[PDB]
Amino acid sequence: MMSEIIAVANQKGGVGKTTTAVNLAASLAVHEKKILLIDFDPQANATSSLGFRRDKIDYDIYHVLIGRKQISQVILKTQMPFLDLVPSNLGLAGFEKTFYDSQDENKRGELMLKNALESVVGLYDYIIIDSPPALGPLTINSLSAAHSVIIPIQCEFFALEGTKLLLNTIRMLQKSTNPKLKIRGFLPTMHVPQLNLTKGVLAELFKYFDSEFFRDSATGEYIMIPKSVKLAESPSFGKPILLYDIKSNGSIAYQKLAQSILQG
Amino acid sequence: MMSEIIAVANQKGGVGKTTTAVNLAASLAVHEKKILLIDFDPQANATSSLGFRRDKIDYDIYHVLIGRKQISQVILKTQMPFLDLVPSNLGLAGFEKTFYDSQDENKRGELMLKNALESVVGLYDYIIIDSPPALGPLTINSLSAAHSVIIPIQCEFFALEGTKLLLNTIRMLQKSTNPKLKIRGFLPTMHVPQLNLTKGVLAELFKYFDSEFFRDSATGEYIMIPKSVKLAESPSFGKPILLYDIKSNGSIAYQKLAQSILQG
Amino acid sequence: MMSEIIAVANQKGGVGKTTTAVNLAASLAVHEKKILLIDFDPQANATSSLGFRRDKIDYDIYHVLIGRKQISQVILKTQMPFLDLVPSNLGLAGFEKTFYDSQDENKRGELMLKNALESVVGLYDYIIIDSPPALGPLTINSLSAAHSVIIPIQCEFFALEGTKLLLNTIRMLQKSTNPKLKIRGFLPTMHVPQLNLTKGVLAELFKYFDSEFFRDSATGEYIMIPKSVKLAESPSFGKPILLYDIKSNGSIAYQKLAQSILQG
Amino acid sequence: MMSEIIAVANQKGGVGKTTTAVNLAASLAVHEKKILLIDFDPQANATSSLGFRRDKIDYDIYHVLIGRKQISQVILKTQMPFLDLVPSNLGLAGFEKTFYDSQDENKRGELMLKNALESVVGLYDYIIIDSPPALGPLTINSLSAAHSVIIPIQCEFFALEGTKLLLNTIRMLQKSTNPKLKIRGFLPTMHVPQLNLTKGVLAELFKYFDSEFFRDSATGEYIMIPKSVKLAESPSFGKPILLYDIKSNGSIAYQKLAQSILQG
DNA sequence: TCCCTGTTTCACGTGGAACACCCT
DNA sequence: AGGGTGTTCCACGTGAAACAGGGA
């Protein structure tokens, strides 16, 4: 078995990584492929996006990382049979400090998620890592474990400057800890295609990275997640979009994305 | 003269800390008050919004915090004569580790920005601090220096959970490092007033904090930053809203906010 | 006992006079008051709305008006024991010529229904008259017999000229043949409260005649017949609504109107 | 030219005779065919639907009928260059009386409009006569003058029985005054296709007249004018649909009606 | 059989954004 | 260009109507 580990990371906040991670885990699970979703955000927004109470959460990914628990100990099962969740909690914040301690003694600790996943990388088809809004210790784990990264891009101004910096970190890890690391693609999120700022910022990213933009290679048209209030309602009902409204366009786009991920 | 030091912070990403910080700084500056805007985010989105190139930026608040530099050295003057900026860069990220080097050694380092600011706090009326989307060391400095905090709320689902944690952290620092700290107000931003998820999240937040909401005290009415494409186009021109589009509603909103802050 | 003789008239077609007449008669009959419903329309829409067969009906109000029959001869008893019907047929169309013959012969004939009615006017509590869509002879009789008039209003454009014109003709008779005639009230019908044309036409009519709009005198709110497919399904079963579907909103409306008419 | 005369008549009120007449005149005028539209209704709602004043109308179809005027004297020009209007006014009511005087002397007067129209039957391609909600003298004139009749049917209950009666009158004229008379078709109006009452009355009327239903010769499919609030606003701006909102479904439908009429 | 609640589909109103005139 | 004007597109909310188990 070969888990593809796809890290949904992007250091910018509010750009759709928790909406993308949760909902791709879902929309790929319905393709009857076994999905594990890691919640690497100390806010634990993905955990709650699937209906859990972080407050009624005993053991989570932190204790796996430091070795106090096996990752197979913490996995929870979700309302979707094919989607299982490694939940998160505020305790994951501690990991920041933890990380630098290894940085002081043996320059490891980028690869803690790498080791924590090693024991289930054959039990799942896809392991999707929802990353927190930083380029800090946690995000670096997320990338180091990963086969590829999915980059949610909200076509507003700062996502210009932001992206290159992120890619910079990628290359750095591509020369340092994770050689295999590929960009699985760029994913426009919250898309409003008729705004002019969006036309411009998309055009810029096209210029530097059109080859990285997700196309449903079935019809080749670009796959962009539409701004959908329904997409932002779905976690409130402890549900993906698939279980909350399978016919809304948020869902259509995230299933199209899953199709594209699958076609190769 | 004694600057009110006001941190626009919130640990959730994309919620308007940077947009509110830039545009409150500007909308107060035109009111003929001398403002310093600190960019406490390694993303340097506030710097970038005022038209600078982070990449053609020499020394920043990082070198201030490590003592290599004076806070008064790094200040740049902006296209508004009354608004000054302390810029940022990824080097500020390094502070993460620097902070914990204090936590291991003498359990301070909460109050670093407080001390570096000490030398410019009488040279300004308001010091407006744009925070990063975390509860880590940087936001801890950002809050601890501050007299009061402005909490921009994106009225969607997670604004529920997050907010409670944020205030608790506020309460925590009030009982440890900054006892004088006040909540200046909550700030609904990107407001689509007719959406149902918004009505709901506003209702919950009203029940728990209705009095802490920015009111146009002339009419008592709520002050809410409307979703406005122009509010998000303006930094692509390195301009605040009032220099980019003074008549749009994003702008009118921020000047009502600024007026409210001045009235007390 | 002195039956109030209430004419539901309006010169525009399809505005609910036949639906209002049937359903007010029924909603008052359920209040244990004895009601006679005159079908003054050669279409005999009120007749068939109560389940009779215009074709298997022998003698009708025509032969009453020409004296060939007593008004007490043509009355049929209906599916409601307290509701009686003077039925109609196409032969009532003949009366047009006949009217002008009286116009030619003794300058009466507006008051023919009045005369034909004299023999049943104390035998009923309310005598409810479904008028045809004109200001011609039949409607002139119908107003001339009547104590008061109920004007069903379809809140579209032509209700504007139309309304004031109907009121005009009312005043004419009030100064000539039937001065006692009172406007029992105005009744918005088929009411869709959110359409903009309705808002506009209602606002116009309000400015000119708000005091005439039927109010739930219990709660003072307006009485408006909601658009109810069932209100239009009921006559196909030869039934009023309260015999058809008493919990529907059309039904509650007509009963609220009935309460209002009795309430004073 | 040989003017086709199409009388839009049906005795039930509020079934679309006037919205249909006005709008077919318009949708036919735009095929660059010369249209003369008679307002044969004393309410003259067709006149007022074309932006004219009953208040500003000097000579109208009444004075033509009594011979005091030429039809060519009263014709007006409309905002559409290929559509001209013979307007109406409440004085047309007088014609009722007029008709019976001839019934008393030489049993003519069905053929008054026929005679008045005699002078423009080569100057127009189509002359469209909007009838009042009666089977009275005017409606009979309109049918007698006309080559064919267009019958708007609102698929509710009373338009079941009503239809049979109307056809009877056709046959009467077809046997007495007007042998050429054709039913150009039945035209479903205010159509709500998913209501069950509408399905049913359609099914019934299909049963009896399935061959009389207007087919868009393009798809063979039935042409049924949808409930369109915009179709009902159009007279408030003195305009047809095609000048007021040419892309709404009201307009497309009245245009399809125009094409079907044109093919023959 | 009488009822009661979850879903669909559809028109219409609303308010934002782009765009094209248009003043002048 | 700057500073109105209205026209076109789209998402979302609403509320009515047909329908469908589900219910003993």
Ligand SMILES: Nc1ncnc2c1ncn2[C@@H]1O[C@H](COP(=O)(O)OP(=O)(O)OP(=O)(O)O)[C@@H](O)[C@H]1O
């Ligand atoms: N395509 C979309 N349309 C509408 N709303 C969306 C869309 N994608 C995401 N959202 C909403 O945007 C808000 C934040 O997005 P989300 O948390 O998924 O991004 P994030 O980067 O994970 O945030 P953070 O970095 O703070 O964890 C939520 O309300 C989310 O539901």
Ligand SMILES: Nc1ncnc2c1ncn2[C@@H]1O[C@H](COP(=O)(O)OP(=O)(O)OP(=O)(O)O)[C@@H](O)[C@H]1O
């Ligand atoms: N009132 C508003 N209307 C429309 N767009 C807005 C508004 N406020 C902010 N935005 C936009 O939303 C995007 C994210 O917002 P912004 O970066 O101001 O929030 P933030 O707090 O800076 O994010 P971070 O949390 O990472 O600092 C930006 O393109 C910004 O222009």
Ligand SMILES: Nc1ncnc2c1ncn2[C@@H]1O[C@H](COP(=O)(O)OP(=O)(O)OP(=O)(O)O)[C@@H](O)[C@H]1O
């Ligand atoms: N409030 C309502 N909701 C729904 N349908 C209605 C309503 N009121 C009337 N209708 C329907 O509209 C159609 C015509 O209304 P109705 O015939 O009662 O008015 P009318 O004055 O009788 O017409 P006429 O002017 O020819 O006598 C009927 O099938 C009727 O059932």
Ligand SMILES: Nc1ncnc2c1ncn2[C@@H]1O[C@H](COP(=O)(O)OP(=O)(O)OP(=O)(O)O)[C@@H](O)[C@H]1O
């Ligand atoms: N397709 C439609 N959708 C919505 N409203 C409509 C439609 N057609 C007509 N109406 C409106 O319903 C009302 C009456 O229709 P209209 O007067 O054309 O029928 P009518 O037969 O002319 O009435 P009359 O029998 O008194 O002549 C008007 O306000 C009319 O514009």
Ligand SMILES: [Mg+2]
């Ligand atoms: Mg998240």
Ligand SMILES: [Mg+2]
């Ligand atoms: Mg920021």
Ligand SMILES: [Mg+2]
């Ligand atoms: Mg009637």
Ligand SMILES: [Mg+2]
């Ligand atoms: Mg008419």
